[PDB]
Design a protein around this motif. Structure first.
Motif, short mmCIF file in Angstrom:
data_model
loop_
_atom_site.label_atom_id
_atom_site.label_comp_id
_atom_site.label_asym_id
_atom_site.label_seq_id
_atom_site.Cartn_x
_atom_site.Cartn_y
_atom_site.Cartn_z
N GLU A 1 0.86 -1.18 0.00
CA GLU A 1 0.00 0.00 0.00
C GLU A 1 0.91 1.24 0.00
N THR B 1 6.68 0.20 8.11
CA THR B 1 7.23 -0.38 6.89
C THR B 1 8.59 -1.05 7.19
N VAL C 1 1.87 4.88 1.01
CA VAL C 1 1.61 5.77 2.14
C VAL C 1 2.12 7.16 1.74
C1 LIG Z 1 12.95 2.36 3.97
C2 LIG Z 1 12.02 3.06 4.81
C3 LIG Z 1 10.98 3.84 4.14
C4 LIG Z 1 10.88 3.89 2.67
C5 LIG Z 1 9.73 4.67 1.99
N1 LIG Z 1 8.76 3.50 1.78
C6 LIG Z 1 7.42 3.64 1.48
N2 LIG Z 1 6.88 4.87 1.03
C7 LIG Z 1 5.57 5.04 0.75
N3 LIG Z 1 4.72 4.02 0.91
C8 LIG Z 1 5.14 2.76 1.32
N4 LIG Z 1 4.49 1.59 1.56
C9 LIG Z 1 5.42 0.64 1.68
N5 LIG Z 1 6.56 1.23 1.99
C10 LIG Z 1 6.50 2.53 1.61
C11 LIG Z 1 11.83 3.15 1.82
C12 LIG Z 1 12.86 2.41 2.48
#
Ligand SMILES: c1ccc(CNc2ncnc3[nH]cnc23)cc1
Lengths: 20, 337
Positions: free
Chosen positions: B108, B170, B110
């Motif tokens: 999903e 996450t 975010v």
């Molecule tokens: C490590 C920590 C955060 C991110 C940014 N992830 C991320 N961004 C947006 N939506 C999500 N749903 C699943 N993961 C994400 C990338 C690497």
């Protein structure tokens, strides 16, 4: 101040995970 | 009733844990848009599912890089656990698949960005703002730990803010299903419990220590143990000498002293009353636990969204084109993915 010491440190960006 | 909710949640988890979803989509069903964040094995990209018009966040793992970094088992843990869990504060895994070169986890999207970005920009969160986030972590860990899962990577970088200003956890790269003690040295320097630094066998109590670090960082604007090099951070943690900003309430300090407890026989979350020692603590007296879970508490911060597919709440990253080899790489290592 502790804030000024933190802001001037090299650890204010996204921190990498460590392993093994 | 919490006991009843949890037992039913466990039945749901176990069925997916024992029979995991596998090969539920293909790369060509998604339009790749932009990199939301990076890592050692690849990137997390904003994608568009053509059949539905839905945007998703796709984690790409290069199998050869995973193997080189000895992260095979950890990767299989990440996908196996993520496909089996179900909680309001855990990012949903929509699809997973693999090709000759890579592993893919479609989650999903975010849009609100990482808590990390908002915390660094604003400086620090007020105690009610920090309490709102901390309460969601407390429930998430109560849920994960009841399923024998240790998260092992709590930090603002891994906490995403949704459209309702609620947290989505996450990155499950270090998550593990363990009934006993475990030994792997993993996590983030600032968030590591002393047991981990001291190469001792450890359990779920490491997540409760990490919660202490998170609450401190959200309310102070900086972590309780920082230095330019990880070795210096480790020296600070093992001493466990914590100094609190003058603006920290007496209740906040007391909660943090119990969470950042080097002595496991004294650490909150680790005692005979478990999570209830945290949930009943004075600093959480104003928290309505049921209303947090139900998302009926108004969020102190709602991010801006200029429509679907907008990425402005995320930093820009250098783009690398996806190359899928003619030959299958590491087939046997990742057969269960
Ligand atoms: C490590 C920590 C955060 C991110 C940014 N992830 C991320 N961004 C947006 N939506 C999500 N749903 C699943 N993961 C994400 C990338 C690497």
């Amino acid at each position: 101040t502790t804030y000024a010491d933190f802001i001037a440190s090299g650890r204010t960006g996204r921190r990498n995970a460590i392993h093994d | 009733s919490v006991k009843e909710f949890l037992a039913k949640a466990k039945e749901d988890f176990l069925k997916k844990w024992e029979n995991p979803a596998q090969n539920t989509a293909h790369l060509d069903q998604f339009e790749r848009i932009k990199t939301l964040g990076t890592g050692s094995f690849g990137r997390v990209m904003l994608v568009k599912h053509m059949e539905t018009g839905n945007h998703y966040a796709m984690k790409i793992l290069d199998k050869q890089k995973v193997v080189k970094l000895k992260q095979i088992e950890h990767t299989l843990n990440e996908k196996r656990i993520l496909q089996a869990v179900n909680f309001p504060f855990l990012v949903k895994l929509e699809f997973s698949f693999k090709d000759n070169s890579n592993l893919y986890m479609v989650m999903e999207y975010v849009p609100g960005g990482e808590m990390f970005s908002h915390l660094r920009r604003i400086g620090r969160f007020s105690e009610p703002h920090a309490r709102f986030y901390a309460a969601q972590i407390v429930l998430t860990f109560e849920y994960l730990h009841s399923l024998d899962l240790i998260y092992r990577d709590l930090k603002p970088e891994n906490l995403l803010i949704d459209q309702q200003g609620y947290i989505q956890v996450t990155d499950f790269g270090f998550a593990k299903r363990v009934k006993g003690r475990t030994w792997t040295l993993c996590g983030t320097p600032e968030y590591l419990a002393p047991e981990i630094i001291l190469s001792k066998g450890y359990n779920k109590a490491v997540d409760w220590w990490a919660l202490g670090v998170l609450i401190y960082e959200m309310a102070a604007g900086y972590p309780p143990f920082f230095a330019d090099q990880p070795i210096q951070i480790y020296e600070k943690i093992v001493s466990g000498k914590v100094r609190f900003p003058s603006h920290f309430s007496s209740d906040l300090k007391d909660l943090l002293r119990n969470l950042l407890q080097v002595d496991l026989t004294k650490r909150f979350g680790n005692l005979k009353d478990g999570v209830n020692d945290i949930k009943n603590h004075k600093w959480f007296a104003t928290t309505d636990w049921i209303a947090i879970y139900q998302r009926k508490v108004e969020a102190p911060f709602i991010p801006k969204f200029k429509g679907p597919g907008d990425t402005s709440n995320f930093d820009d990253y250098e783009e690398e084109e996806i190359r899928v080899s003619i030959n299958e790489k590491c087939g046997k290592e990742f057969s269960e993915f």
